[PDB]
Short mmCIF file of C-alpha atoms and ligand atoms in Angstrom, two decimals:
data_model
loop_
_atom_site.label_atom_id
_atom_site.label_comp_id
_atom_site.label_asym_id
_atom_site.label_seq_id
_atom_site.Cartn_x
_atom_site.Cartn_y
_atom_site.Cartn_z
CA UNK M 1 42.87 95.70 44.65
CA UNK M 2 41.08 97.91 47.09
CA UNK M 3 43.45 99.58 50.19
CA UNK M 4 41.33 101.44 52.65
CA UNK M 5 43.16 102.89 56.01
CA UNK M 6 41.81 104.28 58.62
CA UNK M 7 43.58 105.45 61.91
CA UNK A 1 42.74 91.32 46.75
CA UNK A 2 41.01 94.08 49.76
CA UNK A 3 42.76 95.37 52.73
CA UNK A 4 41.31 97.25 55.06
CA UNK A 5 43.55 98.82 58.12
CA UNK A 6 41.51 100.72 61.17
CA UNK A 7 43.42 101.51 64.43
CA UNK Y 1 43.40 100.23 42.01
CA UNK Y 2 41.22 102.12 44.87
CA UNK Y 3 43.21 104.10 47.54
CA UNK Y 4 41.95 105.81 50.48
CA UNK Y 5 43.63 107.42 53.23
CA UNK Y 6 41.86 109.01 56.42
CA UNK Y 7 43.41 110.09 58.97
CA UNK U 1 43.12 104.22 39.59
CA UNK U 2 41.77 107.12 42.27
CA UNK U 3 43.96 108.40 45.12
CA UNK U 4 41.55 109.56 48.13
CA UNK U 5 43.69 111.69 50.54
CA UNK U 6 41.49 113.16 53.93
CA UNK U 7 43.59 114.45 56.87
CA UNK L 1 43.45 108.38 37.58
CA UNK L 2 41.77 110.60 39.87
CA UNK L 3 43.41 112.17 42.53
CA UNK L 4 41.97 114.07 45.57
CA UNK L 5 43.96 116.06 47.92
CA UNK L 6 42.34 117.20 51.95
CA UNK L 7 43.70 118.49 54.45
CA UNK E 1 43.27 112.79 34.77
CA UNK E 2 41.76 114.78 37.58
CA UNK E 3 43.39 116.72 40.26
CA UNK E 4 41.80 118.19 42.74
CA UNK E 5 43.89 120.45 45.58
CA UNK E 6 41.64 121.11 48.67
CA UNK E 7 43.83 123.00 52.29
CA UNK O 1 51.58 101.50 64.98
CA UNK O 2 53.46 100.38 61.43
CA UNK O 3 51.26 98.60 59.25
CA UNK O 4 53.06 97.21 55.87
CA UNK O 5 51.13 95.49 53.04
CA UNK O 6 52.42 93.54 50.26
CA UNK O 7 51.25 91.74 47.72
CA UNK D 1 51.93 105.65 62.31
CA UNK D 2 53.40 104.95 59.20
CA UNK D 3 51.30 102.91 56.70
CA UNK D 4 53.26 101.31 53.81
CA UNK D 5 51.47 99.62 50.53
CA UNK D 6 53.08 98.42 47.88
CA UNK D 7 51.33 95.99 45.17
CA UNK X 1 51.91 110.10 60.42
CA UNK X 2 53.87 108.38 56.88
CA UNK X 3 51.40 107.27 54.49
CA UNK X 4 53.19 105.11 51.28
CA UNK X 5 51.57 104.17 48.24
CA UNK X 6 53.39 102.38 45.52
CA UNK X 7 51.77 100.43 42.90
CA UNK V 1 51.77 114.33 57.75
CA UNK V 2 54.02 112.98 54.28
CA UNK V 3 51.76 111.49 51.92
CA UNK V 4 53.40 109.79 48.91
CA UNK V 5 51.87 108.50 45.33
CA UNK V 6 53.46 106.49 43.35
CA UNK V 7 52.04 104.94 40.05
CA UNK P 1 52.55 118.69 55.17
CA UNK P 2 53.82 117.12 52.15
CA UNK P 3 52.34 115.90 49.14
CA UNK P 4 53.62 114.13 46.20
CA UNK P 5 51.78 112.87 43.40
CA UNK P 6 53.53 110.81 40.55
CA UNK P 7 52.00 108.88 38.24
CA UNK I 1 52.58 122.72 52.71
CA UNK I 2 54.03 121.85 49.61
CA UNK I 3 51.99 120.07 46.37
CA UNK I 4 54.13 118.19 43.82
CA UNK I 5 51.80 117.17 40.59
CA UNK I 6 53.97 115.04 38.19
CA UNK I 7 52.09 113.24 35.11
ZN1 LIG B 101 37.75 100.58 47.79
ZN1 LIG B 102 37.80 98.09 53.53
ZN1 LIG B 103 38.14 106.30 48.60
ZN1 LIG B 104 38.08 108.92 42.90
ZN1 LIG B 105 38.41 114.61 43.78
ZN1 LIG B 106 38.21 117.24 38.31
ZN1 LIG B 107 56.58 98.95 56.18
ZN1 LIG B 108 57.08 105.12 56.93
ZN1 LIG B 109 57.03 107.39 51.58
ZN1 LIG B 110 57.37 113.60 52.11
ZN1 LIG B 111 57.41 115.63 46.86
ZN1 LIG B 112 57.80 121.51 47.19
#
């Protein structure tokens, strides 16, 4: 599984 | 499974 | 698992 | 797993 | 596990 | 396991 | 902005 | 912005 | 900003 | 800015 | 800042 | 800032 976040 | 969050 | 966080 | 953290 | 701390 | 502290 | 993921 | 990830 | 990772 | 790792 | 690694 | 490394 692979979460990216950007903000 | 890939989430990806940009705000 | 890949996590990234940038913020 | 890798951890990125970028703030 | 690779962990990267940033700020 | 690699930590890396980076502020 | 709260942005939860589950899964 | 709180971000939340739980798998 | 909260960031949350549990896995 | 509270970043939290849990694994 | 806080950060808290556990794994 | 404070750095907790626990593993
Ligand atoms: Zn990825
Ligand atoms: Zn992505
Ligand atoms: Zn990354
Ligand atoms: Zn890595
Ligand atoms: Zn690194
Ligand atoms: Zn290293
Ligand atoms: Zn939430
Ligand atoms: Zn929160
Ligand atoms: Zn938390
Ligand atoms: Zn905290
Ligand atoms: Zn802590
Ligand atoms: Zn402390």
């Amino acid at each position: 599984i692979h979460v990216h976040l950007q903000i």
